[PDB]
Amino acid sequence: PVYVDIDADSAFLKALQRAYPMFEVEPRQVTPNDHANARAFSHLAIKLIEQEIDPDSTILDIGSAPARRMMSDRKYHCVCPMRSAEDPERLANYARKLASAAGKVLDRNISGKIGDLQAVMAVPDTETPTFCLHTDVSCRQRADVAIYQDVYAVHAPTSLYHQAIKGVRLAYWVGFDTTPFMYNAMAGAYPSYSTNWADEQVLKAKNIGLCSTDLTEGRRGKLSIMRGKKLEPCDRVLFSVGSTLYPESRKLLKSWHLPSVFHLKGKLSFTCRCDTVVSCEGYVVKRITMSPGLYGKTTGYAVTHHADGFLMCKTTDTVDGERVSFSVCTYVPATICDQMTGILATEVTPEDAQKLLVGLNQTNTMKNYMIPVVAQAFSKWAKECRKDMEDEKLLGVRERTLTCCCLWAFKKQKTHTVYKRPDTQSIQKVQAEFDSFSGLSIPLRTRIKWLL
Amino acid sequence: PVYVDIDADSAFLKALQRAYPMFEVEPRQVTPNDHANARAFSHLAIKLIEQEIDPDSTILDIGSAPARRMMSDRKYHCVCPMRSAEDPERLANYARKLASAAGKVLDRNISGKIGDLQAVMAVPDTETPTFCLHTDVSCRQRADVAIYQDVYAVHAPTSLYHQAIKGVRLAYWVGFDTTPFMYNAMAGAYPSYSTNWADEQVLKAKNIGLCSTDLTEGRRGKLSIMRGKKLEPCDRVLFSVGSTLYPESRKLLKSWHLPSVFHLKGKLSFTCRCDTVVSCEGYVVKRITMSPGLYGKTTGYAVTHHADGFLMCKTTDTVDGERVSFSVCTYVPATICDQMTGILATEVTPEDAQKLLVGLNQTNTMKNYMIPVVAQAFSKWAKECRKDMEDEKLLGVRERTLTCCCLWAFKKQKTHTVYKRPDTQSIQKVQAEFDSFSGLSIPLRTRIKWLL
Amino acid sequence: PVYVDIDADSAFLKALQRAYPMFEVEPRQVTPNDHANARAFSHLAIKLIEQEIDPDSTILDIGSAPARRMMSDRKYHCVCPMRSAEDPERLANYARKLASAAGKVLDRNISGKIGDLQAVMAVPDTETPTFCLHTDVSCRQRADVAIYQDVYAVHAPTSLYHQAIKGVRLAYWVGFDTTPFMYNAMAGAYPSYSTNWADEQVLKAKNIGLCSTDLTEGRRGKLSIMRGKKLEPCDRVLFSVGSTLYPESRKLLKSWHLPSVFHLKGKLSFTCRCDTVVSCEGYVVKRITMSPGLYGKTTGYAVTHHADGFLMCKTTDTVDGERVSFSVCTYVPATICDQMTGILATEVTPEDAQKLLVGLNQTNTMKNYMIPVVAQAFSKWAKECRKDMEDEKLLGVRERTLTCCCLWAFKKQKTHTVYKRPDTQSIQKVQAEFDSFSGLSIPLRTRIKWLL
Ligand SMILES: [Zn+2]
Ligand SMILES: [Zn+2]
Ligand SMILES: [Zn+2]
């Protein structure tokens, strides 16, 4: 019986039960946390992974808090580099957690973890079977399993190659779905997990999930040193999971959208496979398997199955007062998508679509702040579909006109909505075939020994 | 009592019960798998085949994972070539599965399978009664039964001849129905199994099941180096079963659409017969029987019986922005097809047909992402049927006009829908009478012995 | 079982239960206090913090009344400076409370607190483990935990650095949400807590929560020595919690809106993190963690998650008779915000929106004095949204015009409402990376010893 820190009258509790049928998920709410659904999912995902791999196997745990791996009956060589600000408090809490159980419980190798902690304190560069101060790259502890839990600022092929050359044949990546970033949206929601993200460029928008703006009156033209001339997605993105914030790279998010098959080609070549094994409303687990040698061939295609609807639409907002249009993505519940099928046979207005969506939502099925952007999206889609039906072509025929040369061109129709309905698949041409592949200080090193 | 890993409140569970009446199918859901229906069907199909062939018989298992044939009381010479990326992990899991049962169970010849595996490890080119690294062609183990389970990238007559000259008299082929590829559709759905497939050319469509596109605004003519002038189905196709992807050849898919009778003519001639014995909403089992000698005569006709409706219609979508039309196939539930009979007596609009289909779907009978393409298909069909009734001809009379020569020509009417209703049969002129008919590396060969 | 001094038939009692699920909150009303909800929250917050940190730890308590920390089983070095007017009576009540328990209870170190009180009386400049007359800066008692409970007239980074250089690694700040002051509103409400605040400049308004005006008849122009020409938020603000008043600095309120990560850079550098762990309708607890050294990097972004709606709108009121417009903020219950989703698809009038809000309020969900300003706000927002939809732009395009130079300018649209819906996030660019960092008299010193 897995216990999840969520309210008993929570609708997510049912979806979570559907995502983990091998467990008896029971609500036991201890904290009023604002991203409780996300922690619930990641907790049940670690449970699944443990139940799935064989014991007596050692598990690297990248970017991890050792404290959350302290009462576990499994060899966790927690690779914990002191890079960000989240890490010294993680290490201090791991120390204060071993000390609170040094002479209480003896089914975990508590004293062995204390000894390895003090060994890595006496030597900052050493490697002990349960703890490491190196990065996932510079670590030297061989293992069979690697686990990436909510770690996105990582280049996937470099990190996976560096685990592969250390004997890791199985990696698990738990995190938010990378599909909204393969579509190059400017902003987006993972509404079930209270998560909103935006490009750094649209943080002064008015009506996306993650923004903040001012009252202005519509004054004279604010001067700029730069001409914009083009509002396009840039690398820097901000995620807010509840009220927790993190910056992230689009390049590193996209690196984790891996094809079904890829090849890691260095001094040691590996043939790797990525599958999505858990998928709940935007949050996924990817099981990656690495094998030595070059086997098979790569198409270079990554596929996303859609259990609920995925929308990416064009919205018009004001960023710092200036009215612009950019793309926005969200997840729509499958039952809402099913109940809109009949409405979407006609051209519907965003206002009628909004009142219909509000009727279908009754307790709410989807979050209401995303209903307008969804309504308008459905309205554009139903419109574009009608324009396809009216401008019907001949079967097997393209009306391409010439470029005064050996070149030909065609009209592109305007697409304001990508609507991926429940039970469809997204397929993207991503890269397979990859070839190219000391941060502590004293006052904390002193502090750790003060607890042991 | 066969146990299937599907939710107990699944409608597929009833159709599956209808497809396997000799079993007592019970839902026991362990995984939230996104193609659970497909694995359920293929599992019950292997059960059927085992209950159907006599024991003490040896069974070749083409393209197979030996791990899924390890707890079975039947002689499976699992021919397992290390061709694709799926194979090294299949072999590693077979090794890690024998080791987890080496001294547990003794009703299976566990230790004999261990000895045969490590004999094929000591010799990569040898043949042992339970394991093989050769292809289905280059294998040398004589058998009575062959089994192709989800094995499509094979030329059927070459493979069947190579099993026949080794004494195989009975082959079973489990897989998706090959009828949509005899019709040359560009894209298609097997909706009950969450499966969508597309030609490589239309992967940037917008509103098929397996596609992905961008937001654009309808900009200037994108330049091409090639003139298209013709959008026609090419050999390369992509299947997505849930989120699992595979490339497939149209030629090799079509090779498995076999006629009722065909002749394999080499040094040893065989008279072969193909029948469909299980058929559930797009997924089939073909029982093939091979007999030495030339017997009877071949018509060259393959027949598909339709328990539910089969649609192939012309849709207009945009591929990479360019509006085109191509053919799309799907399966419609028989009860939906039956309830549309009265509507389809009139000319109906796609919009009215869509609202009627949504009414008939209530819990849904068919998946909703296919309702628009089905609605439009039905409306074309009802329209074309009316145009047949108005342009009635004389009985036994063709109005063919002359070509200034000894040739004559006639008008072809436009056909935008092929609708094969429940209890009708498709018949295609296919080929009978066929005449023309070392992949391991060290680091994995080492790894296998590390588990024995 | 935590007991709260609020009426048993109070709706707040349920929200409070949701904010502290680890407790069994029971109403036990002793006082008819006009800010009972606020004291209930701050009481449950102190309980949470005690249950959360380890005992045997010493705990600074900034700006605190020692009397409210007298029956607690935890080392509270209550730093109590005699700065404001409430502090002599706080000290006298702490003395009169120790005297009423000197020979009653012995689980608290009562006589030790009496001895330390008399030690700080014998020496005004000394430091004893339970009492201090210094400011939070000039105190010299090292600790592990600091607690700021309803302490706003403090510069946050200076105070946190001064606790950090004394060994404090964990700080808790309990107080009203600082988000309305990051938005620079002129006046505002925290309605659940009966709290209204205003800029000193609009205290003579007519229809904000915290104002007072006269009857006039609309006489001749009142003369001013100053031209106003601009009504903008100034530093001085007045809060009224029930009937309790305090002046506040906008700068010091804004200093406590801390980013997720910041750096305190002095002689001793620290890497600090701020998270909101409790959040009920405008009242928050921020857990701050300080670590020695410079770790990671700072974005400079502070995020506010919105469980209920946050409005900032422009109102037109009369201040001292003169009709002006300024910004006003408030919190709208999430259920009211959800039930307005369908209404806000159209352009609605403030009058129709007001009658709809009065309908939705039935016992009231929100306080009624804020319904008109909310109604106005909603109607402006729904209007502005329509103007976004009609003036739709091209995707990724800004129409900026030139300034006869290398500069370009754009139109700003008028924004009269910032509406942050339930489950959205505010994100503000605040400062990380901080580098720049005897009040008693005799007649009371005499009085304190008279009680011991
Ligand atoms: Zn390590
Ligand atoms: Zn073989
Ligand atoms: Zn002090």
PDB file of C-alpha atoms in Angstrom, chain C residues 266-421:
ATOM      1  CA  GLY C 266      29.682  40.025   3.181  1.00  0.00           C
ATOM      2  CA  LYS C 267      32.719  38.960   5.148  1.00  0.00           C
ATOM      3  CA  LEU C 268      30.915  35.597   5.273  1.00  0.00           C
ATOM      4  CA  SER C 269      29.059  34.614   2.111  1.00  0.00           C
ATOM      5  CA  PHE C 270      25.859  32.584   2.192  1.00  0.00           C
ATOM      6  CA  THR C 271      23.611  30.909  -0.371  1.00  0.00           C
ATOM      7  CA  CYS C 272      20.004  31.286   0.715  1.00  0.00           C
ATOM      8  CA  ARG C 273      16.678  29.862  -0.421  1.00  0.00           C
ATOM      9  CA  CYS C 274      13.112  31.032   0.192  1.00  0.00           C
ATOM     10  CA  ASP C 275      10.016  28.849  -0.165  1.00  0.00           C
ATOM     11  CA  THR C 276       6.383  29.380   0.762  1.00  0.00           C
ATOM     12  CA  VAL C 277       5.249  26.408   2.814  1.00  0.00           C
ATOM     13  CA  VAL C 278       1.897  27.653   4.134  1.00  0.00           C
ATOM     14  CA  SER C 279      -0.388  29.976   2.192  1.00  0.00           C
ATOM     15  CA  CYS C 280      -3.981  30.764   3.223  1.00  0.00           C
ATOM     16  CA  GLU C 281      -5.867  33.552   1.419  1.00  0.00           C
ATOM     17  CA  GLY C 282      -3.174  36.206   1.776  1.00  0.00           C
ATOM     18  CA  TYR C 283      -1.307  35.015   4.870  1.00  0.00           C
ATOM     19  CA  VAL C 284       1.911  33.039   4.360  1.00  0.00           C
ATOM     20  CA  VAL C 285       4.812  31.242   5.982  1.00  0.00           C
ATOM     21  CA  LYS C 286       8.160  31.521   4.184  1.00  0.00           C
ATOM     22  CA  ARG C 287      10.812  28.964   5.136  1.00  0.00           C
ATOM     23  CA  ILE C 288      14.279  30.401   4.405  1.00  0.00           C
ATOM     24  CA  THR C 289      17.437  28.268   4.429  1.00  0.00           C
ATOM     25  CA  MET C 290      20.918  29.786   4.656  1.00  0.00           C
ATOM     26  CA  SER C 291      24.102  27.887   3.777  1.00  0.00           C
ATOM     27  CA  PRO C 292      27.713  29.092   4.071  1.00  0.00           C
ATOM     28  CA  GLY C 293      29.460  29.697   0.763  1.00  0.00           C
ATOM     29  CA  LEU C 294      28.523  30.726  -2.761  1.00  0.00           C
ATOM     30  CA  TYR C 295      26.707  27.911  -4.549  1.00  0.00           C
ATOM     31  CA  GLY C 296      24.817  27.857  -7.806  1.00  0.00           C
ATOM     32  CA  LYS C 297      23.546  30.916  -9.615  1.00  0.00           C
ATOM     33  CA  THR C 298      20.704  33.384  -9.146  1.00  0.00           C
ATOM     34  CA  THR C 299      18.006  34.123 -11.696  1.00  0.00           C
ATOM     35  CA  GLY C 300      16.532  36.874  -9.543  1.00  0.00           C
ATOM     36  CA  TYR C 301      12.953  35.681  -9.891  1.00  0.00           C
ATOM     37  CA  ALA C 302      10.353  35.408  -7.154  1.00  0.00           C
ATOM     38  CA  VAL C 303       7.232  33.345  -7.799  1.00  0.00           C
ATOM     39  CA  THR C 304       3.840  33.544  -6.084  1.00  0.00           C
ATOM     40  CA  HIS C 305       1.488  30.615  -6.572  1.00  0.00           C
ATOM     41  CA  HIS C 306      -2.165  31.645  -6.494  1.00  0.00           C
ATOM     42  CA  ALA C 307      -4.573  29.234  -4.834  1.00  0.00           C
ATOM     43  CA  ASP C 308      -7.348  31.804  -4.974  1.00  0.00           C
ATOM     44  CA  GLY C 309      -7.687  34.638  -7.440  1.00  0.00           C
ATOM     45  CA  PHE C 310      -5.615  37.779  -7.086  1.00  0.00           C
ATOM     46  CA  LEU C 311      -6.994  40.988  -8.538  1.00  0.00           C
ATOM     47  CA  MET C 312      -5.331  44.327  -9.069  1.00  0.00           C
ATOM     48  CA  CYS C 313      -7.621  46.797 -10.780  1.00  0.00           C
ATOM     49  CA  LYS C 314      -7.973  50.510 -11.372  1.00  0.00           C
ATOM     50  CA  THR C 315     -10.684  52.182  -9.319  1.00  0.00           C
ATOM     51  CA  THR C 316     -12.000  55.712  -9.517  1.00  0.00           C
ATOM     52  CA  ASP C 317     -12.695  57.132  -6.065  1.00  0.00           C
ATOM     53  CA  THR C 318     -12.714  60.611  -4.516  1.00  0.00           C
ATOM     54  CA  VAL C 319      -9.809  61.389  -2.194  1.00  0.00           C
ATOM     55  CA  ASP C 320     -10.629  64.423  -0.038  1.00  0.00           C
ATOM     56  CA  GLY C 321     -13.346  65.192  -2.562  1.00  0.00           C
ATOM     57  CA  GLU C 322     -11.113  65.066  -5.643  1.00  0.00           C
ATOM     58  CA  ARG C 323     -12.009  62.288  -8.076  1.00  0.00           C
ATOM     59  CA  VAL C 324      -8.892  60.251  -8.941  1.00  0.00           C
ATOM     60  CA  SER C 325      -8.012  56.735 -10.102  1.00  0.00           C
ATOM     61  CA  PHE C 326      -5.542  54.395  -8.450  1.00  0.00           C
ATOM     62  CA  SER C 327      -4.910  50.682  -8.208  1.00  0.00           C
ATOM     63  CA  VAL C 328      -6.518  48.372  -5.656  1.00  0.00           C
ATOM     64  CA  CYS C 329      -5.784  44.715  -4.954  1.00  0.00           C
ATOM     65  CA  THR C 330      -7.775  41.934  -3.340  1.00  0.00           C
ATOM     66  CA  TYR C 331      -8.162  38.170  -3.064  1.00  0.00           C
ATOM     67  CA  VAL C 332     -11.183  36.448  -4.610  1.00  0.00           C
ATOM     68  CA  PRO C 333     -12.145  32.928  -3.446  1.00  0.00           C
ATOM     69  CA  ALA C 334     -11.246  30.210  -5.938  1.00  0.00           C
ATOM     70  CA  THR C 335     -14.830  28.961  -6.145  1.00  0.00           C
ATOM     71  CA  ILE C 336     -16.061  32.451  -7.061  1.00  0.00           C
ATOM     72  CA  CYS C 337     -13.314  32.734  -9.674  1.00  0.00           C
ATOM     73  CA  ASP C 338     -14.289  29.336 -11.090  1.00  0.00           C
ATOM     74  CA  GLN C 339     -17.975  30.240 -11.301  1.00  0.00           C
ATOM     75  CA  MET C 340     -17.172  33.420 -13.242  1.00  0.00           C
ATOM     76  CA  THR C 341     -15.400  31.627 -16.105  1.00  0.00           C
ATOM     77  CA  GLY C 342     -18.433  31.396 -18.380  1.00  0.00           C
ATOM     78  CA  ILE C 343     -19.619  34.939 -17.675  1.00  0.00           C
ATOM     79  CA  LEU C 344     -16.207  36.342 -18.545  1.00  0.00           C
ATOM     80  CA  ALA C 345     -16.295  35.021 -22.124  1.00  0.00           C
ATOM     81  CA  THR C 346     -18.467  38.007 -23.070  1.00  0.00           C
ATOM     82  CA  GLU C 347     -18.203  41.685 -22.397  1.00  0.00           C
ATOM     83  CA  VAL C 348     -20.153  42.095 -19.170  1.00  0.00           C
ATOM     84  CA  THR C 349     -21.106  45.264 -17.390  1.00  0.00           C
ATOM     85  CA  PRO C 350     -19.937  46.003 -13.840  1.00  0.00           C
ATOM     86  CA  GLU C 351     -23.581  46.102 -12.835  1.00  0.00           C
ATOM     87  CA  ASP C 352     -24.414  42.720 -14.341  1.00  0.00           C
ATOM     88  CA  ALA C 353     -21.168  41.290 -12.983  1.00  0.00           C
ATOM     89  CA  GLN C 354     -22.104  42.658  -9.562  1.00  0.00           C
ATOM     90  CA  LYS C 355     -25.536  41.069  -9.581  1.00  0.00           C
ATOM     91  CA  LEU C 356     -23.975  37.787 -10.714  1.00  0.00           C
ATOM     92  CA  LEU C 357     -21.366  37.934  -7.946  1.00  0.00           C
ATOM     93  CA  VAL C 358     -24.095  38.634  -5.395  1.00  0.00           C
ATOM     94  CA  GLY C 359     -25.944  35.612  -6.726  1.00  0.00           C
ATOM     95  CA  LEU C 360     -22.870  33.391  -6.448  1.00  0.00           C
ATOM     96  CA  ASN C 361     -22.237  34.563  -2.872  1.00  0.00           C
ATOM     97  CA  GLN C 362     -25.633  33.300  -1.599  1.00  0.00           C
ATOM     98  CA  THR C 363     -23.805  33.268   4.589  1.00  0.00           C
ATOM     99  CA  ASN C 364     -21.233  34.746   2.204  1.00  0.00           C
ATOM    100  CA  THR C 365     -18.203  33.232   0.495  1.00  0.00           C
ATOM    101  CA  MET C 366     -16.435  36.561  -0.013  1.00  0.00           C
ATOM    102  CA  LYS C 367     -16.887  39.786   1.921  1.00  0.00           C
ATOM    103  CA  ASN C 368     -19.372  42.097   0.281  1.00  0.00           C
ATOM    104  CA  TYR C 369     -17.508  45.409   0.538  1.00  0.00           C
ATOM    105  CA  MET C 370     -15.119  44.100  -2.077  1.00  0.00           C
ATOM    106  CA  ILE C 371     -17.794  42.857  -4.510  1.00  0.00           C
ATOM    107  CA  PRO C 372     -18.168  46.177  -6.399  1.00  0.00           C
ATOM    108  CA  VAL C 373     -14.424  46.606  -6.964  1.00  0.00           C
ATOM    109  CA  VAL C 374     -14.191  42.960  -7.996  1.00  0.00           C
ATOM    110  CA  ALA C 375     -17.155  43.392 -10.337  1.00  0.00           C
ATOM    111  CA  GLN C 376     -15.574  46.407 -12.014  1.00  0.00           C
ATOM    112  CA  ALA C 377     -12.326  44.438 -12.266  1.00  0.00           C
ATOM    113  CA  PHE C 378     -13.919  41.410 -13.872  1.00  0.00           C
ATOM    114  CA  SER C 379     -15.770  43.537 -16.377  1.00  0.00           C
ATOM    115  CA  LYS C 380     -12.619  45.374 -17.386  1.00  0.00           C
ATOM    116  CA  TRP C 381     -10.730  42.111 -17.754  1.00  0.00           C
ATOM    117  CA  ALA C 382     -13.388  40.455 -19.897  1.00  0.00           C
ATOM    118  CA  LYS C 383     -13.380  43.587 -22.018  1.00  0.00           C
ATOM    119  CA  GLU C 384      -9.608  43.685 -22.473  1.00  0.00           C
ATOM    120  CA  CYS C 385      -9.562  39.997 -23.383  1.00  0.00           C
ATOM    121  CA  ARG C 386     -12.021  40.620 -26.190  1.00  0.00           C
ATOM    122  CA  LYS C 387      -9.817  43.412 -27.468  1.00  0.00           C
ATOM    123  CA  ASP C 388      -6.929  40.965 -27.542  1.00  0.00           C
ATOM    124  CA  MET C 389      -8.939  38.507 -29.604  1.00  0.00           C
ATOM    125  CA  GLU C 390     -10.051  41.038 -32.203  1.00  0.00           C
ATOM    126  CA  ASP C 391      -6.622  42.647 -32.631  1.00  0.00           C
ATOM    127  CA  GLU C 392      -4.904  39.361 -33.381  1.00  0.00           C
ATOM    128  CA  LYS C 393      -1.359  39.661 -34.693  1.00  0.00           C
ATOM    129  CA  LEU C 394       0.928  37.483 -36.733  1.00  0.00           C
ATOM    130  CA  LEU C 395       2.820  34.718 -35.002  1.00  0.00           C
ATOM    131  CA  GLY C 396       6.273  35.872 -33.969  1.00  0.00           C
ATOM    132  CA  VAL C 397       5.960  39.437 -35.234  1.00  0.00           C
ATOM    133  CA  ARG C 398       6.147  42.858 -33.610  1.00  0.00           C
ATOM    134  CA  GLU C 399       5.049  45.984 -35.479  1.00  0.00           C
ATOM    135  CA  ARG C 400       7.512  48.456 -33.993  1.00  0.00           C
ATOM    136  CA  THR C 401       7.971  51.856 -35.655  1.00  0.00           C
ATOM    137  CA  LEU C 402      11.130  53.927 -35.790  1.00  0.00           C
ATOM    138  CA  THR C 403      12.099  57.097 -33.904  1.00  0.00           C
ATOM    139  CA  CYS C 404      14.011  58.940 -36.681  1.00  0.00           C
ATOM    140  CA  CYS C 405      17.117  57.362 -35.104  1.00  0.00           C
ATOM    141  CA  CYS C 406      18.370  53.899 -34.202  1.00  0.00           C
ATOM    142  CA  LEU C 407      15.452  53.569 -31.738  1.00  0.00           C
ATOM    143  CA  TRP C 408      12.051  51.923 -32.222  1.00  0.00           C
ATOM    144  CA  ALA C 409       8.784  52.224 -30.317  1.00  0.00           C
ATOM    145  CA  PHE C 410       5.478  50.383 -30.019  1.00  0.00           C
ATOM    146  CA  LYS C 411       2.009  51.114 -28.721  1.00  0.00           C
ATOM    147  CA  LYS C 412       1.177  49.937 -25.230  1.00  0.00           C
ATOM    148  CA  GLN C 413      -2.412  48.851 -24.842  1.00  0.00           C
ATOM    149  CA  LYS C 414      -4.237  50.020 -21.763  1.00  0.00           C
ATOM    150  CA  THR C 415      -4.343  47.498 -18.919  1.00  0.00           C
ATOM    151  CA  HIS C 416      -6.865  48.250 -16.204  1.00  0.00           C
ATOM    152  CA  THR C 417      -6.927  44.807 -14.563  1.00  0.00           C
ATOM    153  CA  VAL C 418      -4.283  42.280 -13.653  1.00  0.00           C
ATOM    154  CA  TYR C 419      -6.204  39.100 -12.881  1.00  0.00           C
ATOM    155  CA  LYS C 420      -4.192  36.157 -11.538  1.00  0.00           C
ATOM    156  CA  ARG C 421      -6.538  33.200 -11.618  1.00  0.00           C
TER     157      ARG C 421
END
